[PDB]
């Protein structure tokens, strides 16, 4: 019967919740009480990239920490050179409605997608020197919200159809499909080892997925509204979520609990992007307050603010070497903060 | 450097194309269309000339782009903000929905649901300033439907004859009672005129009005 399984199912949530309390020995805030603070983090706009004629939704750094990508509703995908602020490529999109970007780890490929329900992959290194579109991954039924390359052939995408998928670019078919989210999936983050990835959905939950098996290992709750951004800790043993509850939370994968909440009474708008520092000591979160805060990731003390944007800070990414932090916004400008 | 210099030559040749095409594109007119499945958006688009379907037609040297977002079947909360700043919001409702009901809900009138969508859209925080063109289609069909069937069925409080004129009127103002931003947005309602297809000329005229009112901002009238 439905009630047999339901009265059963609500019990299974109890042992999960019962065991999590038993493993809640002491709060990270108590353990990190005597750590010396990070001090005022004064970070200034070094470079400002101009050339977008609409609001920016997505940006992604390169693995060489110098090039980066950005997409906007103007239907242009631009590859920047952050050092010399000069445009390397300006890719016209078939669909002006683009909500995500990814720059391949090898830098041979770039991918974008949005309301067109397609993940388009553009080839950068092309004999005829004109970025050409390679493949169009059309297997989703809702807007694509995120996409992250594993290799030049594997890309994992999260969509508004409550499902994530792992693709094979050569064949253009979903190698694996991740199901179990009861709300629209907003963002995903890959583990450093590229064996696991966590996804945040509109159902106020984050799920840890396994890329090979295709089954969800753990599910984290605690937020009150949509989860809009997610990133792993550098060591791949923790991750942070940005929600519309104007709180950032640091979850652990081994302890399977929540550690911190980064909430401030002053802040009432929703978090749009989150990202870490190379050491994992700073958690940069791009709010709707038009500004971007920098949190002490082990003290939960707002040490630093990056207020330079007219409109909301849509995307926010840090370099692999951690020498810079770049924030996009709806004001059509990318700013490199160092 | 020799290299760096040639580089930035490209970067400016990029920027020339950007601005240029940005201005070719900014010249186009962007209408967002919404509605119920049977609103007859399909029949409107037919009159005017996957996922988000885009439609292109020109009228009196004006280019129109229509973003039929009918099928997204996802949380509108997350993707509507993308269309903020479309010139106007064409909204189609079929007048023939007063006696119906969705096959999914028990007895919630299709018309009462049409209002709720409009309610949430005319009162959407992202379109505080946007004008709303309201096409009310299916007028003839409403005429026949009303000629036999009462309107009290849908509006229990209705003081008026089943005369098409009076009947429609109530509704029109009824839809226009949804907006809280009374002189913040202007609702230009038209009744679908099948044959003349001046459905489009109404649009031409509707568009200009909103544009003209907006120009009174850009013209430095302040």
């Amino acid at each position: 019967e439905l009630d047999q399984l339901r009265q059963e199912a609500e019990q299974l949530k109890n042992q999960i919740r019962d065991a999590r309390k038993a493993c809640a020995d002491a709060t990270l805030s108590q353990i990190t009480n005597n750590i010396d603070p990070v001090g005022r983090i004064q970070m200034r706009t070094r470079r400002t990239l101009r050339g977008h004629l609409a609001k920016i939704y997505a940006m992604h750094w390169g693995t060489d920490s110098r090039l980066l990508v950005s997409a906007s509703q103007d239907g242009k995908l631009i590859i920047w050179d952050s050092y010399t602020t000069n445009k390397v490529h300006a890719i016209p999109l078939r669909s002006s409605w683009v909500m995500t970007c990814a720059y391949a780890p090898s830098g041979n490929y770039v991918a974008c997608g949005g309301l067109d329900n397609i993940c388009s992959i553009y080839n950068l290194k092309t004999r005829e020197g004109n970025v050409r579109v390679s493949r169009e991954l059309a297997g989703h039924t809702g807007y694509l919200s995120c996409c992250r390359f594993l290799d030049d052939n594997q890309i994992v995408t999260s969509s508004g159809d409550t499902t994530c998928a792992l693709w094979d670019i050569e064949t253009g078919q979903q190698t694996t499909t991740f199901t179990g989210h009861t709300g629209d999936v907003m963002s995903l983050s890959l583990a450093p080892d590229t064996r696991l990835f966590v996804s945040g959905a509109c159902d106020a939950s984050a799920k840890l997925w396994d890329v090979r098996e295709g089954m969800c290992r753990q599910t984290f709750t605690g937020h009150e509204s949509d989860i809009n951004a997610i990133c792993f800790f550098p060591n791949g043993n923790a991750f942070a979520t940005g929600s519309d509850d104007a709180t950032c939370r640091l979850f652990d994968l081994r302890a399977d609990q929540e550690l911190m909440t980064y909430s401030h009474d002053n802040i009432i708008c929703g978090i749009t992007s989150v990202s870490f520092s190379k050491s994992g000591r700073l958690l940069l979160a791009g709010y709707d307050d038009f500004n971007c805060n920098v949190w002490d990731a082990l003290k939960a003390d707002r040490a630093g603010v990056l207020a330079g944007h007219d409109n909301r800070v849509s995307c926010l990414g840090v370099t692999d070497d951690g020498m810079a932090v770049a924030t996009g916004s709806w004001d059509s400008f990318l700013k490199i903060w160092n | 450097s020799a290299e760096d210099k040639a580089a930035v030559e490209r970067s400016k040749m990029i920027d020339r194309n950007l601005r240029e095409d940005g201005e070719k594109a900014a010249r186009e007119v962007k209408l967002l269309l919404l509605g119920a499945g049977e609103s007859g958006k399909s029949t409107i688009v037919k009159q005017m000339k996957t996922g988000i379907v885009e439609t292109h037609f020109t009228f009196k040297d004006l280019h129109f782009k229509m973003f039929d977002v009918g099928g997204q079947r996802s949380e509108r909360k997350k993707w509507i903000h993308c269309f903020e700043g479309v010139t106007a919001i064409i909204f189609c409702v079929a007048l023939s929905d007063y006696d119906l009901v969705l096959a999914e809900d028990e007895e919630m009138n299709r018309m009462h649901e049409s209002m709720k969508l409009f309610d949430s859209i005319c009162n959407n925080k992202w379109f505080t300033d946007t004008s709303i063109i309201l096409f009310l289609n299916k007028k003839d069909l409403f005429e026949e439907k009303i000629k036999k069937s009462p309107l009290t069925i849908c509006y229990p409080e209705y003081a008026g004859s089943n005369t098409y004129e009076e009947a429609a009127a109530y509704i029109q103002c009824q839809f226009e009672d949804l907006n809280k931003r009374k002189d913040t947005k202007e609702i230009y309602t038209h009744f679908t005129c099948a044959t003349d297809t001046k459905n489009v000329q109404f649009v031409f005229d509707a568009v200009t009005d909103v544009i003209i009112k907006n120009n009174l901002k850009d013209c430095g009238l302040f």
Partner: single-chain antibody
Amino acid sequence: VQLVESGGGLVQPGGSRKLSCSASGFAFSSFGMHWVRQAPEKGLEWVAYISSGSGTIYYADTVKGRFTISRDDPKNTLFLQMTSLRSEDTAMYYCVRSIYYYGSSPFDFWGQGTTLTVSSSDIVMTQATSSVPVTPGESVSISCRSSKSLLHSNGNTYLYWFLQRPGQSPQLLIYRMSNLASGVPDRFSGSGSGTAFTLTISRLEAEDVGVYYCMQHLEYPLTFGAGTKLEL
């Protein structure tokens, strides 16, 4: 992606002839083109250059004010207008394409060039090795020397390498020091700093025997070096 040029042949001195290079199979409108001439017995020598969209036109010392270079983007052609040819303009005129953006490979593709026989503050690159004997399966190193520090401020040593097999157009091997061109085996490698440069081949074959060239790109007019022919 082939490039073919038209013209050349036999011209009396003082005559004005035109060279047309019809690009085919690539985005010609976004490629900075060059012209490079090779004397019948001597090495390469840069002559002209046009940027993308005819924004920047440069020339060599020997052809300044004597040559006019133009491009026709819609027809995918490149033109060279030569005026009052001298006896020292007898050379094979290759046409080279190059695109300049972060990480690009300029001078990657070379035309077949045309034969032209007239009737009758500059960096100098020096390599004093010619007709060096070598056997297949051995390791050979080719050394180059500059008169100026090619290592720019940003760390880019704008030194290039080329390989001209007998009876073929020159082919890029190394577009900057410690970099490897597209479609060239891993055997070729180059390590150097400032004014000292080397090209190391681990194991060679009958296919890569020929003459090698060194070019700098720190500043115009892109002076080349003398040849370095591998003997086999």
